[model samples]
Target: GKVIRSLNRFGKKVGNALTSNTAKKIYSTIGKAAERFAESEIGSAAIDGLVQGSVHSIITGESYGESVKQAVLLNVLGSGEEIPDPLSPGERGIQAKLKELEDEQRNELVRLKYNDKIKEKFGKELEEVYNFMNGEANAEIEDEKQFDILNKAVTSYNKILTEEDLQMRRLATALQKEIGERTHAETVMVKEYRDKIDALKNAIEVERDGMQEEAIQEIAGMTADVLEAASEEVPLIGAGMATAVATGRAIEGAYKLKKVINALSGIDLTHLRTPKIEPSVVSTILEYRAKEIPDNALAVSVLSKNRAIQENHKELMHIKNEILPRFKKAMDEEKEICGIEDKVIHPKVMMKFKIPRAQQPQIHVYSAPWDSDDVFFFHCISHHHANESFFLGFDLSIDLVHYEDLTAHWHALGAAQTAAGRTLTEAYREFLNLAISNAFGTQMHTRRLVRSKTVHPIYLGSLHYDISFSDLRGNAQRIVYDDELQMHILRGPIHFQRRAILGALKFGCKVLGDRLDVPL
Candidate 1:
């Protein structure tokens, strides 16, 4: 008959198995995810993601992997930092941010040096105007002009900003997916471990105490031999000092990974889409070269006889001061509605909202039609809802040919006019919103991602009805319901709608600073 033996105490056996096996499984999966994430392109970014996503949770209540990752990604990409709009947690390190800005300035100058045309147009002229700054180094133009040249440059750097934004988002989602995968694998390992325990129990012929060195050797030897026959790679020999170090690293990595898990569960990176400058405005900044040139249009016009300046500079100044302020005021109202503008900063990352209504009787009569919030809308998924999707803008005398309800802004109105006009980059945003809304249930879809140029709260969302299907799969593909627009509309006053936005950005930065064994 086969020798039969058992672990005398069932509770002790279960406790030992849980302490060694279950604990090992959890630590093992987390270790793998962390190792993969850390080793991935944005390894450094993972720390910040964890910091933002998990920090709040650790401080405030829920402590779990799911919560941490969600918060981290939402913070970076979702909206503005959640500390408090205008002055928030990320704003705490402005001194360090300034240092980073200076470095960016230095880099911008270096990048600008390649423009020969810029040199041709302004170099000699600037040299003539200022004599003290004769040296090539000192004669260099300031950042305002440098930005103009950089805008004209073909390369269009900072390519990684958007790319990083997207990557961070994908990684967060991927991290969630991976954790699930590894957790399953760990479940299997536990099963295998249980099998090992069962085999060891059955093979033991003699009862032995824990300190019976020879008996343990005999049992371990036989069990390990069974393991070899079973073809598992786990070591069956004595638990040596080297094994202790491996165990230690797993323990250490587990502790570190836990922090990461806690920190990464709560953020989004979509909030980076603010403070975008119009390409024309930033690149071809319409500066009046009054001293250098003259225009005859102002040369004694017959009707409006006024002292004409050397150029149309006064017309621009008038727009900047008079009309621009009105537009700015109108936009401010809308920003408050969009929740992009806040009560804190001097030069806020502002947004321009416009939905030109041709025939809203009340607004048309009052000449205040542009102020109404309900005139325009972005049709979304029929299943979901939208609030304050589109806001009022200037009264439009014309409409688009293809779509009558749409009044063209930005490129729709021509680049030069859009650049010189009072509208902000809201045209682009509204366009995207409209496109997303217009095709609510049409299976066909097309659109591009919009990004802002500066640190600003991104104001963008969609309706639930607008479904875009793909012919490739015989179903309308879905638009990404970013964290910014998840269950909430854009009408509320809040910092980041989700934490993943920040996580995505930080993740992107981390990826840039790391080593990777990932497939592109």
Candidate 2:
């Protein structure tokens, strides 16, 4: 019975395997047909060129139809059009777009300014009618008839202003004059007030017109012609533009372990370099970091695999037990300060100096809370010269919520300069000193994580990329709320950060208010 059951299962597996293999080859003919087509008039090169043109459209601000217009013209007709001397086709598009956006931004500001004046006119008329009926708030008339008359008066006065075209200054003047002359209450006072308000309205009208022509102008003196000329001078300039600043890098586990030794003890390690390690030992190291074997099995295999494994293992053991202790003793005896004030740094006691899990694992001293009470970590992994060198900047761990403020942007450049200008020994020592300062400043910030500085969008100038501030503020607020340990709201009411919310709202109004028809 058991033999029959096993045979049945084995037969089922064979049938499914054959079915899967048959299904795999069913659609392969379509793939072969595509390869044959690439050799003809509609080649792969043309398709790839179309894709590149589409991407270039984003920087040029071209409409979707217009974006692929050049590619289509070339492919279908077998000749690309000649762009004019002043502008390449793409730059011509961008220059026109800049003008359009600038004009739209001005028009938006004018509409907002007009609305504010209209709002003020309504408020003034409504308030006047209320004062004429009620006189003073202290005197309360009990009569229902008197109160009813004032209520109707207020409603009628508002209705007239609301229905009239306040956009025309003459219409506004006529309405105010009519109200002053005809009102059933105090005539002289209303007339004098009306005259003063009309004069102010006229002044504001002139100011609005003056402000209307342009709100923003050409950026970096890039008038349409200048931009066009630049576009002609530089071919494919967008390709060379910096996508992002390089902030960090990852290196091999063994290479980083070697660096830590040189940093702590000032020891040159040509003896245990990459070439010295045996191929079988390198294979085992790779397997360990990849987590391919169990810890017990790996340990057992390390000893029994080959004599090279035993030799490398013995060297590592000596590093941990003999060399590391000797380095620690020397630091204690001399009281050497690496940076700020730190005695012990670089792969502190118990940090594993083996193969890394990721192909790019951070080998620098990671958040050393033990050396100092405060937690500190690297915020910028600035740049690299392959595996030979890199730059790092340390920040308090508490500032993780707004890490952008803590970054040192110039340090990467400085590191590269140092490497070029100095001796071999000094460059190594310089980065080692930076790594130690991270240990020295290992304390978390105790203050509440509120933004300390005002952010002005205009300071970044016209060529800056705009982010969704509403989305950013929402994310910041959400992250703050997620904390198990909360920031204490200052005594009476809202969060301390709430004071900045008015500025945030104003920024929101600037970016998004024009699109919305918000009801009063």
Candidate 3:
């Protein structure tokens, strides 16, 4: 049974091998050669010897050489066929040829059968080669020489099988490598996903804790005061109650309650309970200082050397007599821009007059509580020959009190000139800066007094300059020592002096009063 099983396994392996077209061609060529040789006389003798050799080997277990020689002698003598020169020299040569042929054929037959197992299994185009070999072998192979051809075919088939097996092994190795890499990549992806999930979970937990802490603090603040009072009043019972409250809340709330108690203990309530009032003297000083104008020596010198005063003396005097009286009338009748209740006192009044042929001119009049309330400063912007000019002066004789202490006039002749022949606008800007700086100085002094808190009700008079007509004209001409010159020059006759008043009704309405701690 074991031998039969082994034979079956070998047969299965042989059946599984593939055939080749080259192998079939080789078998066909060998079979044709064998058939042609079998028809020859030498072939017949060789066949007889072959059969005899096989029978002798089977019966006596003799070698092929001895067996073929014995078979050859018996075949020549014992056969009842026609004898040709029995025991002749030709007969001996024929015998020798028979033995040689027998040996060759016997060897070929053995090799062919050996090749049959391989060719039938591992041969290509096996339909033709397999059928031919089987029929020739089964028919006792009347003639054949296929071993060499079959061997060549099987050798090539084995080579093909080996190459195919090697290719398969390479393919398997590559597939395994690819699988390993892909698996590693997937593992990394899974690890990254796990990390992201863990991070999100941590973030969510932290946010939840923070919100919980906030809610706990809110609850703790609401109960902190009641718990503290209870603890202070009842000693043992309160302490027990506090412990119960703290236990009911989380530890976070207990800490927050402690912070709240410490915060409350550090605050002072005295300022909220009682407020101090300012003294009457301090209030009076602040009020008076709000309307004060400080003295400026530069402004006095600049104004005292006014050139327009003398250059247009007659014209200005005529205006002072005629135009100013009308302006004063208008000033007395008009209500103040900022109402008296607004607590702002406007010491400056701006006016504009339009002469028939002259350029539209503007006049600024400033008044303060002088020695007799008669002092006034006048600054004017006018145009002559299409050129801008300015005039600055103070009128001491004009009692502005009758006109609400706000009556003055300005005039320009030959365009007001400065040392550098500056434009009227430039001169006006410089004059304005000088005035504001002086005002700011006064404010600084007042701030110092208020800060000291020891100011008294003393008269702080403003600065004034007395300018004559000649001095103003010479100043416009840039003449040296012009202020000492007393010259009277007549001004041109006025063709028309048209006056139109434009004023703001709510000027200086919002005064800085509440925040006195900072500089204006």
lDDT by residue (tens digit), candidate 2, 379-472: 1121111112222112222222211211111221111222222322233233233333433343442221342111111000011101122222
Writing each residue's lDDT as its tens digit, candidate 1 over 71-163 gives 111111112222222223244345234533443433333223322332342223222222212235553335333212211121111121222
| Number of colliding residue pairs in each model | 77, 8, 10
Models, CA RMSD each: 30.3, 34.6, 68.9
Candidate 2 pairs with clashing backbones: 247-381, 247-382, 248-381, 374-442, 374-443, 374-444, 375-443, 375-444
- In angstroms, the error of model 2 at 164 is 19
Between candidates 1 and 3, the TM-score winner: 1
Better model by lDDT, 1 or 3?
3
Candidate 2 residues lying further than 4 Å off, grouped into runs, are 1-41, 44-468, 471-520
Ranking of candidates on TM-score, top first = 1, 2, 3
Local lDDT at 469 for model 1: 10
